[PDB]
Symmetry: C2
Subunit: 85 residues, 2 copies
């Protein structure tokens, strides 16, 4: 009954950390999926990218996508902003 | 200065999550050597597949890793023993 992913008019996405990495990849039109299945959700993917629990504002750029941490909770990354470039 | 790894007489290790996976691998005599510059805390995040809670454990390759604490930035202290 709740929102996992939303896209603004300007094309930016706000996505929940528990979205599957395949769904994130599909929506962002970029294959983020690990061959060896080390991560399964967008939050898991980012935790793997950082190798620690990031703060708000930290970002990773992957193949021209910027992933900005918006919130983090006790069990996963929370809200992630994603935009190109 | 601050202690990154401690062993007890019964063979169990208490390690900081920031400890390198290289050092952990060496101390535990187990090839966890993860992406190699990885840390123990980073390794355990992807083993669990979420940020775990105090008292959770996971068994990987004949080693039991128990989360003792977790802070804002990484897994805090980890307790490791065999089998």
């Amino acid at each position: 009954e709740k929102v996992v992913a939303e896209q603004q008019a300007d094309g930016t996405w706000l996505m929940d950390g528990w979205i599957s990495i395949r769904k994130a990849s599909n929506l962002l039109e970029h294959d983020l999926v690990d061959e060896a299945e080390r991560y399964s959700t967008l939050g898991g993917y980012l935790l793997w990218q950082f190798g620690y629990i990031p703060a708000a504002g930290e970002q990773i750029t992957v193949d021209g996508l910027i992933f900005e941490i918006v919130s983090v909770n006790k069990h996963n990354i929370g809200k992630v902003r994603v935009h190109r470039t």
